[PDB]
Design a protein around this ligand. Structure first.
Ligand SMILES: *C[C@@](*)(O)[C@H](CCCNC(N)=[NH2+])NC(=O)[C@@H]1CCCN1C(=O)[C@H](N)Cc1ccccc1
Ligand SMILES: *[C@@H]1O[C@H](CO)[C@@H](O)[C@H](O)[C@H]1NC(C)=O
Ligand SMILES: [Zn+2]
Ligand SMILES: [Zn+2]
Ligand SMILES: [Zn+2]
Lengths: 257, 43
């Protein structure tokens, strides 16, 4: 996350960290949607151009984890994965269309003041909140800056980072990049003239883009960090998987397995 | 209110409880930046 701030304790209890099992390596973000299901981005698990193709046994998740390195027993939880499900029509070859995956936890995680699921949007909440200019919040353990060269440190935070960003109009998103955008994505970030900055970055994929509903005071996951050009570049915007557009697939996978 | 969409037999528990944080919404306390979000709905 670029130009974000440190998260307060318990501010994003649905935050999930996805790690390589061996050797231990933080890979991506993810979100908790029930006591046994986690949502993430497909490219965190499968992306052939980077020789990435993980199986359930190659990974683990940490939940309620506040410090990047400090273990807080009785607060953070570790869970193994029973199964991974990647959208069958995830287009990794071209533009990461349908960049979404579900992961089933081997054992359910207990809810606490630090671990809680986020809501998925129903049609009317999505219609209301997914409007250009409305802001959402993105969280992650990813890079703090774009690099220039690989040997310059990209910053690794010690506390989850959070940034609030406005949804951008579809024609503006489309014109900002040569990648072919689909209705399964939306983009967010500040325009060059808005006097504010901020963006997700590499390492933040799979993390949630959430919005608070003014109707029932609950947080809804509207997007999943998916892709962008560098990070926090003027005139560029971050792209997110449109969770409501892919809700019928989530249902089919879960209420079918 | 909240109406559930998924079947608990396969979804597991928590859907009716979702999106309310014990240390904020359940204690009627705002986190430090959520007003920026709420304000964007009106401005
Ligand atoms: C896997 C994630 O951590 C990462 C998120 C980057 C978000 N960036 C911004 N500025 N919000 N995603 C990626 O790195 C994805 C994975 C494949 C490459 N990619 C990109 O973002 C590329 N830089 C552009 C691209 C390549 C192919 C298909 C679509 C996008
Ligand atoms: C991922 O790896 C497995 C081999 O174990 C294979 O089924 C599949 O083809 C790979 N996915 C790709 C490259 O699309
Ligand atoms: Zn803690
Ligand atoms: Zn609860
Ligand atoms: Zn105002």
């Amino acid at each position: 996350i670029v130009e974000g701030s440190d998260a307060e304790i318990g501010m994003s209890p649905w935050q999930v960290m996805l790690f390589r099992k061996s050797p231990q390596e933080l890979l991506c973000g993810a979100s908790l949607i029930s006591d046994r299901w986690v949502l993430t981005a497909a490219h965190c698990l499968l992306y052939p151009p980077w020789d990435k193709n993980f199986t359930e046994n190659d990974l683990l998740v940490r939940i309620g984890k506040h410090s990047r390195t400090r273990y807080e027993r009785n607060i953070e939880k570790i869970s193994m994965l029973e199964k991974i499900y990647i959208h069958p029509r995830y287009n990794w070859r071209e533009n990461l269309d349908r960049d979404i995956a579900l992961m089933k936890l081997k054992k359910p995680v207990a809810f606490s003041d630090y671990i809680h699921p986020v809501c998925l949007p129903d049609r009317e909440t999505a219609a209301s909140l997914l409007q250009a200019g409305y802001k959402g919040r993105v969280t992650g353990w990813g890079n703090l800056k774009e690099t220039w060269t690989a040997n310059v440190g990209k910053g690794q935070p010690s506390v989850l980072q959070v940034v609030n960003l406005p949804i951008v109009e579809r024609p503006v998103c489309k014109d900002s990049t040569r990648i072919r955008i689909t209705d399964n994505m939306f983009c967010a970030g500040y325009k060059p003239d808005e006097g504010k900055r901020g963006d997700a970055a590499e390492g933040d994929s799979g993390g949630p883009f959430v919005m608070k509903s003014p109707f029932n005071n609950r947080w809804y996951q509207m997007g999943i960090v998916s892709w962008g050009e560098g990070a926090d570049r003027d005139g560029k915007y971050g792209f997110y998987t449109h969770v409501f557009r892919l809700k019928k697939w989530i249902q089919k996978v879960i209420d079918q397995f | 209110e909240y109406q559930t969409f998924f079947n608990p037999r396969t979804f597991g528990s928590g859907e009716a409880d979702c999106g309310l944080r014990p240390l904020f919404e359940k204690k009627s306390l705002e986190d430090k930046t959520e007003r920026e979000l709420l304000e964007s709905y009106i401005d």
